[PDB]
Design an enzyme around this catalytic site. Structure first.
Site: not given
Ligand SMILES: [Cl-]
Ligand SMILES: [Cl-]
Ligand SMILES: [K+]
Ligand SMILES: [K+]
Lengths: 461, 461
Positions: A252, A300-303, A380, A415
């Protein structure tokens, strides 16, 4: 003033090319780690993402340096953030571990070279086949998210005669968790769940787990939630007569998507990062050390690992002017539409999560961005334009912008790949990597026509 | 009352199995065209979509019968709605044409057997390569969306020595079009654009085009916009001395996603369909006939062709109870969470467009749906649960619901396949078709692990 908004945006633009560790200018063009992005977008067909191994490394360094006060910290990149194999390889070569969110994520992490002892597998739906694959591969952790799932972990570990290493996910009610949090057990269930695991022959209880959320703009949520988990860890050590290996506090850490913090309120607009990795670490470490200084802390860093480390490059592929006229035929306003070859099938969070990314003319990066425009994609679909502008739904580009120019969206590394679609049967994009030496290579192909139909079963022609 | 909401929902459930042309019950299970969906979901791994060729045919019949007062009507299915090859084949075999939204859509329509003279190609970004492919394939129509694009149409048709058949898209300002509508030309630009096309040697002007929008809950927008296009068509015939082949009025016929119209306001909640195909046809035909009764009317329905014609089948794969307690340890409320193996990576519009779909326990379809539950997906994302409930974020299922039961989402046939993602590296789903004889076959495979990584370029292990 809009003049003031325009002045501020051009100050930000100058800071990109004179004041950002990632970027430079050459030949009037935006460069990333010395790579001219206009030139790059003539070598590969747009739209495509370009990642920077140097910036991934810098982000990992921020994270690990933030935890300097706690030696026994283990860092698992949340691979839902981006699992292109060359991105995972850069992360593995930078020396950290991996968190995985499905059976196929576990498998690709193993394939790219993360060892079993470097992988955490989390989930709310871990079916028997998923659990069998994970347990057979000796993963460092499999989280326990529910009592129902735990019964499968017990039965399958017994069948395989292989120890399943687990952490029990507990989601604290920090002032509604029961209504809004699908994941984890209630605090009140932690004791009996741990007691039962201790009695299982082939399940090894390692600690508790939580994960607060994403792009969190304040430290307090982490401090309060960590304290809950720490207090229950301490209490269970006493009650159950055990010593936990670890505590897993999740991810987070936010990333700045807008940089002019003096003009932002992170609690109202969380495109402003409200906190740094150091703030996250200070909150977590301080709370854990009230219990033990030796226990392992898993994060658990992601971003934060990849967010700042990619640019989306997209060609201006069409243009038009639309004019509103009053009932007497007099002009009320003009709108200058610029169409790029990437829409929300390519950059999904710009549409679905109101996500802001800086937008610049990479081909004219040293020119004043002095014209208000609306930026549309190629789908479209009347909704396929970029609504998160500099001012409302309006962006700023040089008035001299021309079809053929390359537009860059910054901070496009988290992401943005696995969330792409083939809506309108536009292909999912290629991906390029700038390695540590400044050299480029293709790490994902653009989907081909064969890929649009190869999944379908039909009578040929 | 929630009792009243529960009573109403169970009346709707009874009407599904006793009062719906698509469905029946057998062995306590929901059946679709006589196919037991519990049994089907044991033959194929969940989650997957099942389409009905019989219901596609019934929907096409509604549309064509609505236009009975205008013989020269041509119907083009908007294939962005769903382009799985077996779905397109059913639509082609039902006797209508196809609208396409990219080069690869054009190609797959040709491949499945639509002729060039049965294809309209629309777009805001039609690059030279796209236009060359379309013109070379003798398409019935290529729309003209901008003056910039028109220059490419002129140049490429000249190069190929092949006539490009065009319709000029005009988006009327019907009380802000300049700010909110990226597509088409302004009404004020139609005359000069048409005059210029008339002078091009290899471009054939066929008429004007518009498209109002999607899931439109009132007839007035169609009537007013059609009148604008008709009035300008009439005027240009006089000014330019020509007779148009056609007028293309687009799509937007809504589909009912909630059926208890007595309890709904379509202008506030457009899950209630505010209008029928007959209302759409009455509005369009009435306006066109004020100009000409012989001209061809082209329509481009997407959602109405397939929306009602598929079900998403997903297994209940986990369950848990979460409880909120007060500070004295007394229970404040319980939440019964049911986890299905499909989340928003599988059913994207349930998350991104606040889209409601009826949800029932297909395995217990004749049992009272008498328990309030929250319905979660399998993604490692706190937002991956279904928020568009029966009452707020709460759904109704039988209290007897068990892990292993099959949940059905109805009306899942429009905009549900190509919008899927591989977020968390969960695979995009298989797709099954029930043909006209009531027999089933797989028409799309589930993405395999090979498919997660086959696009990536990396050093093997
Ligand atoms: Cl580590
Ligand atoms: Cl037709
Ligand atoms: K044990
Ligand atoms: K002509």
């Amino acid at each position: 003033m809009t003049d003031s908004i325009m002045q501020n945006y051009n100050q930000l633009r100058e800071q990109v090319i004179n004041g950002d560790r990632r970027f430079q200018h050459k030949d009037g063009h935006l460069c990333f780690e010395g790579v001219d992005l206009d030139a790059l977008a003539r070598q590969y067909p747009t739209p495509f993402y370009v990642f920077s191994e140097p910036e991934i490394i810098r982000n990992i360094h921020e994270i690990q340096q933030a935890f300097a006060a706690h030696k026994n910290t283990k860092t698992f990149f949340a691979s839902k953030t981006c699992s292109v194999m060359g991105v995972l390889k850069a992360i593995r070569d930078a020396g950290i571990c991996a968190e995985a969110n499905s059976q196929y994520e576990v498998r690709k992490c193993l394939e790219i070279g993360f060892r079993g002892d470097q992988i955490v597998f989390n989930g709310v739906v871990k079916k028997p086949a998923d659990l069998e694959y994970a347990i057979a591969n000796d993963l460092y952790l499999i989280n326990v998210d529910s009592l129902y799932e735990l019964e499968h972990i017990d039965a399958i570990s017994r069948k395989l005669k292989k120890v399943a290493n687990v952490c029990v996910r507990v989601e604290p009610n920090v002032p509604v968790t029961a209504f809004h949090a699908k994941s984890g057990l209630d605090l009140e269930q932690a004791e009996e769940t741990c007691r039962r695991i201790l009695a299982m022959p082939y399940v090894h209880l390692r600690g508790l787990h939580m994960h607060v959320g994403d792009q969190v703009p304040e430290s307090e949520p982490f401090a309060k939630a960590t304290k809950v988990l720490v207090d229950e860890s301490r209490r269970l050590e006493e009650v159950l007569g055990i010593k936990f290996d670890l505590i897993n506090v999740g991810g987070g850490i936010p990333v700045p998507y807008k940089y002019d913090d003096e003009n932002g309120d992170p609690l109202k607009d969380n495109m402003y990062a409200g906190i740094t990795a150091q703030d996250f670490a200070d909150a977590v470490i301080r709370e854990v050390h009230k219990w033990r200084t030796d226990v392992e802390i898993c994060i658990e860093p992601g971003r934060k690992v990849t967010g700042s480390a990619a640019v989306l490059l997209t060609e201006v592929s069409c243009e038009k002017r639309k004019t509103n006229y009053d009932l007497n035929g007099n002009v009320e306003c003009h709108v200058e539409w610029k169409f790029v070859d990437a829409g929300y099938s390519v950059l999904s969070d710009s549409q679905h999560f109101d996500w802001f990314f800086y937008v610049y003319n990479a081909s004219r990066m040293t020119a004043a961005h002095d014209a208000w425009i609306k930026l549309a994609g190629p789908l479209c679909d009347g909704g396929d334009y970029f609504h998160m502008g500099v001012k409302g739904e309006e962006f700023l580009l040089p008035k001299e912008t021309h079809v053929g120019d390359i537009v860059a969206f910054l901070d496009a590394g988290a992401y943005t790949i696995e969330s792409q679609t083939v809506f309108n049967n536009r292909p999912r994009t290629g991906v390029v990597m700038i390695d540590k030496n400044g050299d480029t290579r293709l790490i994902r192909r653009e989907d081909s026509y064969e890929d649009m139909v190869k999944y379908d079963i039909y009578l040929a022609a």
